[PDB]
């Protein structure tokens, strides 16, 4: 149950997805996965498989969640 995500704000945001390889968890929204339906059969985090992904946007979304708690 470790969250390791591209936002570097690794607390539970309520919707996480588990990397198939390293078994660490990411925030689905940081990876553009808005709901369960957007999650593919196979899934690897950005550490296990570098991808094009908007890291600044991920940080912005998560930092905003934290800032308005």
């Amino acid at each position: 149950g470790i969250i390791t995500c591209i936002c570097d704000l690794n607390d539970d945001d309520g919707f996480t997805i588990q990397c198939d390889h390293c078994n660490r968890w990411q925030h689905a929204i940081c990876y553009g996965i808005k709901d369960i339906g957007m999650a593919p059969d196979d899934y690897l985090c950005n550490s296990c498989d570098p991808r094009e992904v908007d890291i600044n946007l991920a940080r912005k979304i998560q930092q905003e969640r934290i800032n308005v708690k």
Binding site: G14, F15, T16, Q18, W25, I36, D42, Y43
Partner: peptide, 11 residues
């Protein structure tokens, strides 16, 4: 993939 999702509701 394997997912965890928490739903918060109020009735």
């Amino acid at each position: 993939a394997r997912t965890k999702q928490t739903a918060r509701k109020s009735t």
